[PDB]
Design a binder for this molecule. Structure first.
Ligand code: SAH
Ligand code: SAH
Ligand code: ZN
Ligand code: ZN
Ligand code: ZN
Ligand code: ZN
Ligand code: ZN
Ligand code: ZN
Lengths: 347, 431, 86
């Protein structure tokens, strides 16, 4: 009972930490990370699932308190993706608050600025850290996971991108500057002579990217060679030990290296490939295999797409007379979580 | 108008505007006051926000909002010991610079600017007599202008009689206890209370000396008349819901506000008529973290200007409370006797050392005592010692620690109430 | 027992026996001896056990195990004949 809590805390003088704010359950597995209160075990699982899930346009996919995508309230800060739901704002803040908020249309959310008086819902201090610690202790098999950066503490992101230029993509993701002559991305085609001294001369980097080519071969050098060159220059672009700043890396395959070379690659990048298809009408138009540390890269995986169907796709797309196009839209949305880590700006 | 606000700040730093001519809290031009702590003007809306928010504190123990604008976005908590102040990012973007907040966060031993050892900074400088101006800032609340309370001439010492107190919202009988500490003869002490444990505390500690009643609301004017003329009516509204400390704040003046008006009604019922010049006195108490319009309605109904009194001046707690009343010398400055403990460490038990010098009652700082390399609560007898109660005051009945602590917390600070009730010795009989 | 009670309390019993569970008729209601009264029953000084933040059930249990103070005074009293005095 979501509505009952307003009696339970006020009349029964009960701590918010003893009840689940996300649904109204009285048995809580732990406390809620972002806001003051407890959280029960299915809601905990639901939260961890939805955690870094965003939408295609840019904003967060589910409701930041309870993870309800059914109803959404968009915050009115260009540097805040946090979207809410009506049931929470009236349940936790008081009986007629979500409609007022909806009628404002210039409403900053709780995280943005809490100076507004709140009925019951209190914002936890330090909450970014609390979120990280929550994921650490509460996720089964936790992963490489970095604390989310406060918005004023967000610097522009330093990209290395090997064998494929991502300037166009990430600029369209507002991550890179259209008005700058000093480029905030360093595209390299040929890495063959490159030394550790050279990658270090090019500056430190925040994001490293590298991808195998599509089926139309620009060169005959085998698809394993790109992977290994990526691994090397990746080990070069790693930040000096002791660095708290967030470092990421993302390798992409356009179905061009076979299972044997794929097994080798899975070993060397120390996780299993994430397949991210293009399905139109139910039909598998295209697909791409990824490795990266980027948050919620692994929950985009589609275990429905079998390896035999990908072998059939590779055979059908090799035998066509069409020139090969980079599948921009598949890996485009796989950079959205870096919004919460790095400086955005749009025009 | 946000761009205009920042623009105004730009014009200030280019020496085209004075910082004292702008409201540094919200950027308004309607400058009436000066900001007490720091340099800049202060509009009246930001005064009201400053009144409501400046002494609010989170469950953390640190401030609920930013010290500068009483609002702000994401605050920056201070690492200095015993300091609980918060500076939001947006203010530090102006007064220190748009690159120094980000570099000050990276500074792990970070002191706030009220605690900064240097004291002076470029756009922000700390005004010197800020505790004096903080004290004056409540005398600055002349928005509610009233006439002074009527001063009655003192009755001769041979004609004095024992005092008769109506004490609404008695709790653990602090008021009678303080009257006995002063040595004033008490003819009768009528007390209206609902919580059984507090009734019990009073019954036992005051053997054969208190007549108990039921609900305040049930008490009629007929009861007030038939229980003798009263010489001192005291009371304090519940501050469990009225404070921001309770996580459950569904209303603000549902419940507690009603009970204030009960004090109001029985104050009129116990007030002698015009022409009856007999000495009558009354005290109301409330917590500082309250609403402005709330404070206005209270000051209007009681027809008086409140006096803030903080217990830090005399005791071992931060206990800032408003006192409305006509008791003589309610304004005069507090004196702390040698029996009163101004350090927390003196209130501790043996074998216990305190990191804090004052605790404020509410991996994080929840419990204020470092005993045997371990964080631990103040013991209940120590909390008694912190407010100036007699030792073991609340150990009457078989009650839990949590309930008993809670019981203790609500109570008035004993040397403060001794400081307020002390000139009543000039008007009533002694033991 | 009535002399060991607090004020406002009247005991039906003249003795309490620890080796009608709740021995006190206060305000037409049956109630346990309070902790400071159990202390008075055995002859401890007043408020002897209120040192730390312990529960009532634990503290009663801590009191009940103890030796009876005038009994141990009666026993230890001839030792004044053998050792120094203050
Ligand atoms: N309707 C009511 N009538 C009487 N007392 C009430 C009441 N509602 C609440 N109370 C009690 O009044 C107190 C509010 S504040 C008590 C402070 C008191 N001066 C003291 O030193 O103990 C609480 O103990 C609360 O339980
Ligand atoms: N191994 C042990 N060593 C020391 N004390 C022990 C013990 N086992 C139990 N005790 C304690 O010894 C007591 C048994 S009887 C205590 C009576 C004591 N004369 C008094 O007046 O308090 C209990 O407090 C019990 O907790
Ligand atoms: Zn739940
Ligand atoms: Zn929600
Ligand atoms: Zn927001
Ligand atoms: Zn202002
Ligand atoms: Zn501020
Ligand atoms: Zn400080």
């Amino acid at each position: 009972g979501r509505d009952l809590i307003a009696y339970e805390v006020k009349a029964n003088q009960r701590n918010i930490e003893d009840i689940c704010i996300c649904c109204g359950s009285l048995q809580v597995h732990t406390q809620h990370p972002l806001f003051e209160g407890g959280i029960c075990a299915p809601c905990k699982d639901k939260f961890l699932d939805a955690l870094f899930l965003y939408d295609d346009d840019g904003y967060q996919s589910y409701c930041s308190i309870c993870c309800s995508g059914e109803t959404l309230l968009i915050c009115g800060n260009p540097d805040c993706t946090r979207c809410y739901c009506f049931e929470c704002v009236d349940s936790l803040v008081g009986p007629g608050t979500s409609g007022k908020v909806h009628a404002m249309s210039n409403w900053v959310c709780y995280l943005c600025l809490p100076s507004s008086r709140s009925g019951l819902l209190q914002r936890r201090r330090k909450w970014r850290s609390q979120l990280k610690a929550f994921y650490d202790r509460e996720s089964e098999n936790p992963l490489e996971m970095f604390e989310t950066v406060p918005v004023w503490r967000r610097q522009p992101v330093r990209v290395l991108s090997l064998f494929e230029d991502i300037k166009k993509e990430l600029t369209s993701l507002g991550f890179l500057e259209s008005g700058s002559d000093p480029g905030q991305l360093k595209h390299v085609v040929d890495v063959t002579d490159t030394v550790r001294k050279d990658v270090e001369e090019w500056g430190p980097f925040d994001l490293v990217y590298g991808a195998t080519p599509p089926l139309g071969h620009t060169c005959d050098r085998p698809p394993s060679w790109y992977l290994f060159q990526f691994h090397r220059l990746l080990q070069y672009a790693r930040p000096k030990p002791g660095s708290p700043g967030p470092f990421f890396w993302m390798f992409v395959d356009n179905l061009v290296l076979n299972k044997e070379d794929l097994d080798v690659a899975s070993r060397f990048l120390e996780m299993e490939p994430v397949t991210i298809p293009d399905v139109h009408g139910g039909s598998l138009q295209n697909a791409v295999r990824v490795w990266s540390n980027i948050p919620a890269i692994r929950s985009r995986h589609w275990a429905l797409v079998s390896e035999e169907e990908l072998s059939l796709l590779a055979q059908n797309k090799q035998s066509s007379k069409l020139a090969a196009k980079w599948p921009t839209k598949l890996v485009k949305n796989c950079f959205l979580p870096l919004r919460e880590y790095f400086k955005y700006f749009s025009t | 108008d946000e761009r205009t606000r920042e623009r105004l700040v730009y014009e200030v730093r280019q020496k085209c505007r004075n910082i004292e001519d702008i409201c540094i809290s919200c950027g308004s031009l309607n400058v009436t006051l000066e900001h007490p702590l720091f340099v800049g003007g202060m509009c009246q809306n930001c005064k009201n926000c400053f009144l409501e928010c400046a002494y609010q504190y989170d469950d953390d123990g640190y401030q609920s909002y930013c010290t500068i604008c009483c609002g702000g976005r994401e605050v920056l908590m201070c690492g200095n010991n015993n300091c609980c102040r918060c500076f939001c990012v947006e203010c530090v973007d102006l007064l220190v610079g748009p690159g120094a907040a980000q570099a000050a966060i990276k500074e792990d031993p970070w002191n706030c600017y009220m605690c900064g050892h240097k004291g002076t900074y470029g756009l922000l400088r700390r005004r010197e007599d800020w505790p004096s101006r903080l004290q004056m800032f409540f005398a600055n609340n002349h928005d509610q202008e009233f006439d002074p309370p009527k001063v009655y001439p003192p009755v001769p010492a041979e004609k004095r009689k024992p005092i008769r107190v109506l004490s609404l919202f008695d709790g653990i009988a602090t008021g009678l206890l303080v009257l006995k500490d002063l040595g004033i003869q008490v003819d009768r002490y009528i007390a209206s209370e609902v919580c059984e444990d507090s009734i019990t505390v009073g019954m036992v500690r005051h053997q054969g000396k208190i007549m108990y009643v039921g609900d305040v609301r049930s008490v009629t004017q007929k009861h007030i008349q038939e229980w003798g003329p009263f010489d001192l009516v005291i009371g304090g509204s519940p501050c469990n819901d009225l404070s921001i400390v309770n996580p459950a704040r569904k209303g603000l003046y549902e419940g507690t506000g009603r009970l204030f008006f009960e004090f109001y009604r029985l104050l009129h019922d116990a007030r002698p008529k015009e022409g009856d010049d007999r000495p009558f006195f009354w005290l109301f108490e409330n917590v500082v973290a309250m609403g402005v319009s709330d404070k206005r309605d209270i000051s209007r109904f009681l027809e008086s200007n409140p006096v803030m009194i903080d217990a830090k001046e005399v005791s071992a707690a931060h206990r800032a409370r408003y006192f409305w009343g006509n008791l003589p010398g309610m304004n005069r400055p507090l004196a702390s006797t040698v029996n009163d403990k101004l350090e927390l460490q003196e209130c501790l038990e043996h074998g216990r050392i305190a990191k804090f010098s004052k605790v404020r009652t509410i991996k994080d700082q929840h419990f204020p005592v470092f005993m045997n390399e371990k964080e631990d609560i103040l013991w209940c007898t120590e909390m008694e010692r912190v407010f100036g109660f007699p030792v073991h005051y609340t150990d009457v009945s078989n009650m839990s620690r949590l309930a008993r602590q809670r019981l203790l917390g609500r109570s008035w600070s004993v040397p403060v109430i001794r400081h307020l009730f002390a000139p009543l010795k000039e008007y009533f009989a002694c033991v």
